[PDB]
Write a protein that binds this ligand. Structure first.
Ligand SMILES: Cc1ccc(C(=O)Nc2ccc(CN3CCN(C)CC3)c(C(F)(F)F)c2)cc1C#Cc1cnc2[nH]ncc2c1
Lengths: 470, 361
């Protein structure tokens, strides 16, 4: 029972926290059903059920004490779903179905159990392509998933707080990528939507009657970006349209400049901003096979060629466009249909290193899909095989690989919820098509390292104590 | 005196085929005449392939001069050749003086100079002696004995057991050490009991800097916004100790240097190639610390403006006698105040003057 667990400290990263004691003083509230029926003695299988009851009490903060109901429904609490699955597993009536205690400790030893915060399954299972968050820290904390399902678009809206979502067609053709602008001086929150027929549209979320459209591009819309202002448009025809943050609220504003950086043979797919504040004046992007950087005055700063990458690595993989870009002290580039990520330097504009995800994956298609990096020197590599690679910027070594939760990571972004907490959204495929959204804590790698050190310390302590006993 | 041009003629003859002992003679000469023959000691080829005195003479002559550009490079070349000839040479090298010269040579502003090949061969020798992880622990212990905090990080990045032995950390805090070293140690693995003993030692020889550096790991939870100094038997309290524990948003993060990381990365590469070939602190627990008087806290110290936001101050099981009034008027957001199991003799009436006291104990 929770009365039989003695706490020795409240420090999280402590060597010893909880201990078990039997004061020698089963109880109706915390008894196994097989024991409640009076069939046999407790044996050992039931203890796992009692431990599951303890988990249900710890999760609900003892709300049950003051045919088990849903933990989130009966009492207000964060999902924490891996332990929900564990509780449902070890609270099964069949004593054979109860996992053994060693199995329970093993599946509790995972850092994914702590870092995975939420999980959402879209029932209609519509094939989703893009998703953008809302920086509004108010109760309007949701996502604006977009997908191409019919001759028109499929404009979804997943509400994290309520887990309910509505989808419909409002953009007249298949939609590719989205972006949001929030004008606090104007109290305006506008989302810009693009179709594959070649138009840019805006749809104000504050009222569905406030709809807008922008100037047509002859190719298909390909990318967007909000520079905190200059709204950037990177099209298949290499255009870099700069949209004023203010005027584009009304339908039919106009671009201030058109920089034909690329062409149709090397479309522009991804842009990003310097993570270091010393280079917050230069904006970067990979235009097909061209890594271009430009100023805040809409003037080019550099034009790098990727084609030299064939002489070192395989020419086949090196003969591909750029899919994702990230700007740090070193430039990291991921190319289409390739299992390698290219590392470049922004000063010499020269190749520096290559990282082969194939070695790490086979150590356990391996094609990289998307990238996200944080100033905490931790790199996330989302693979087309549904695996997430964790790499450190200090040593460029492995940290951990996340799998067996989705079949193919589609999009991975960073955002913040209404509680000011920083999390990471990982959209992964599930083909048996099903679309699953997972919310991961931003302290995942540090948590893995801390948990490794903690369990190693506890193992050493137990070994030393048992050795001194013998 | 004539031995100089004699050794020059020997260097002239070292290229003729089948040069074979001649090692012992020139060894005796170099042992006798230190300076000029060492400049020509690069003529030393693979001879003898096990006298420890030979390597001893070599490394002692190296560190003895250690200030002529190309002779150290030649010595490192010869050393690399000898270790390529025999791996047991490594142990002997680390045994005699190897660290004493490597650290002195690469910490003496080795960077900021066009010595790319020099650093390359040096890191090659590093990666070469990086085998036999026991010797890595020895190198770590010796680098910690010296106040050389530049390469302790390099040794850790290559993989070093900070709990090798009296652990390393207690030895570091026993001597007058630098904050960067103890910080790099605490970031890497360290037994909590070892850190505790280290805190006791550092308390014995009062040093607010290292005390704060230790407490930043032992009893700080950035998540809960709390301090958990419960039962550390810290005989007193000092506002400077808890100074760097409060947020102080004016502080920021800046990469002061990265030369250690670059070093470690390049030695790892050479080893791989050789193998291939707001949010204030709203809680402060000071329970069971065997205190005697809590007047050092407040007194308009640095901590004084980081107490107005405190929302809980546990002080139970200590040994107090009174509560300073200035502490009360400074603590303008307390709600829980625990003083049970102390030794009070009369109730201070002004404890109720606080703004938001709700749970007095
Ligand atoms: C003062 C005291 C004496 C004995 C024990 C005790 O538990 N003994 C005990 C007995 C049996 C078992 C396991 N048997 C095996 C057979 N089975 C059939 C059944 C399980 C266990 C174990 F499970 F450990 F192996 C522990 C605890 C305390 C205590 C205390 C304490 C400490 N701290 C506190 N703070 N506040 C209040 C408080 C109270």
């Amino acid at each position: 029972k929770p009365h039989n667990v003695l706490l020795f400290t409240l420090y999280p990263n402590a060597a010893i926290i909880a201990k078990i004691a039997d004061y020698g003083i089963g109880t109706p509230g915390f008894r196994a059903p097989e024991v409640a029926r009076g069939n046999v003695i407790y044996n050992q299988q039931a203890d796992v059920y009692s431990f599951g009851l303890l988990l249900y009490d710890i999760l609900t903060t003892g709300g049950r004490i003051v045919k088990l109901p849903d933990p989130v429904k009966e009492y207000g609490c964060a999902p924490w779903p891996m332990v929900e699955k564990l509780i449902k597993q070890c609270l099964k009536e069949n004593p054979q179905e109860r996992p053994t205690s060693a199995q329970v400790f093993d599946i509790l030893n995972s850092a994914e159990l702590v870092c995975l915060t939420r999980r959402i399954l879209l029932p209609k299972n519509v094939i989703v392509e893009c998703m953008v968050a809302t920086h509004h820290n108010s109760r309007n904390a949701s996502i604006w998933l977009g997908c191409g399902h019919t001759d028109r678009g499929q404009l979804s809206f997943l509400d994290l707080n309520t887990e309910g979502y509505t989808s419909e067609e409002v953009a007249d053709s298949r939609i590719l990528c989205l972006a949001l602008v929030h004008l606090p001086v104007e109290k305006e929150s506008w989302i810009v939507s693009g179709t594959q027929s070649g138009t840019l549209l805006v749809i104000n979320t504050e009222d569905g009657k406030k709809r807008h459209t922008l100037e047509k591009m002859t190719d298909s819309v390909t990318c967007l970006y909000c520079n905190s202002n200059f709204l950037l448009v990177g099209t298949a025809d290499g255009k870099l349209a700069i949209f004023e943050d203010k005027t584009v609220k009304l339908k039919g504003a106009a671009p201030l400049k058109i920089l034909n950086i690329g062409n149709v043979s090397t479309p522009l797919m991804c842009l990003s901003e310097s993570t270091n504040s010393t280079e917050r004046n230069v904006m970067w992007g990979g235009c097909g096979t061209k890594i271009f950087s430009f100023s805040n005055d809409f003037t080019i700063q550099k034009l790098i060629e990727t084609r030299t990458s064939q002489l070192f690595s395989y020419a086949a993989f090196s003969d591909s466009n750029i899919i994702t870009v990230v700007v740090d002290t070193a430039l990291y580039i991921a190319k289409q249909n390739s299992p390698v990520v290219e590392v470049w330097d922004k000063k010499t504009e020269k190749l520096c290193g290559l990282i082969d995800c194939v070695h790490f994956l086979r150590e356990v298609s391996g094609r990289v899909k998307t990238l996200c990096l944080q100033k905490n020197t931790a790199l996330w590599i989302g693979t087309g095989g549904g695996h997430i690679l964790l790499l450190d910027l200090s040593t460029r070594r492995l940290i951990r690989v996340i799998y067996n939760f989705c079949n193919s990571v589609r999009v991975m972004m960073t955002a913040q919820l209404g509680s000011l907490k920083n999390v990471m959204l990982v959209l992964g495929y599930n083909r048996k098509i099903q679309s699953c959204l997972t919310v991961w804590d931003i302290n995942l790698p540090h948590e893995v390292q801390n948990l490794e050190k903690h369990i190693e310390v506890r193992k050493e302590l137990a070994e030393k104590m048992r050795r001194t006993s013998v | 005196g004539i031995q100089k041009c004699g050794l020059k003629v020997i260097s002239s003859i070292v290229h003729f085929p089948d040069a074979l002992g001649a090692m012992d003679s020139v060894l005796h000469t170099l042992q006798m005449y230190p300076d000029d023959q060492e400049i020509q000691c690069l003529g030393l080829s693979l001879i003898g392939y096990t006298g420890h005195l030979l390597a001893k003479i070599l490394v002692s002559s190296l560190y003895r001069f250690k200030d002529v550009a190309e002779i150290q490079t030649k010595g490192f070349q010869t050393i690399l050749a000898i270790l390529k000839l025999s791996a047991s040479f490594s142990k002997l090298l680390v045994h005699h003086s190897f660290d004493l010269v490597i650290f002195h040579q690469m910490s003496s502003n080795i960077m900021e100079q066009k010595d790319q090949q020099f650093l390359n061969l040096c890191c090659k020798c590093f990666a070469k002696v990086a085998m036999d992880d026991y010797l890595k622990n020895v190198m770590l212990e010796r680098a910690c004995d010296q106040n050389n905090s530049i390469m302790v990080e390099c040794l850790l990045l290559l993989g070093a057991d900070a709990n090798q032995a009296s652990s390393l950390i207690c030895q570091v805090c026993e001597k007058e050490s630098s904050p960067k070293l103890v910080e790099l140690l605490l970031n890497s693995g360290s037994r909590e009991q070892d850190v505790r003993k280290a805190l006791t030692i550092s308390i014995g020889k009062g040093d607010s800097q290292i005390i704060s550096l230790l407490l930043r790991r032992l009893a700080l939870d950035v998540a809960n916004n709390s301090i958990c100094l419960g039962g550390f038997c810290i005989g007193k309290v000092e506002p400077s100790w808890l100074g760097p524990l409060f947020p102080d948003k004016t502080s920021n993060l800046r990469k002061q240097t990265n030369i250690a990381s670059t070093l470690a990365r390049m030695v790892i590469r050479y080893q791989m190639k050789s193998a291939v070939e707001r949010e204030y602190i709203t809680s402060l627990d000071l329970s069971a610390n065997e205190l005697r008087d809590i007047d050092a806290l407040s007194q308009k110290c640095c901590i004084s403006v980081h107490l107005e936001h405190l929302e809980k101050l546990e002080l139970h099981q200590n040994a107090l006698t009174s509560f300073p009034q200035q502490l009360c008027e400074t603590l303008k957001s307390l709600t829980h105040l625990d003083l049970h199991s102390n030794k009070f003799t009369s109730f201070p009436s002004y404890l109720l003057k606080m703004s938001c006291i709700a749970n007095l104990d």
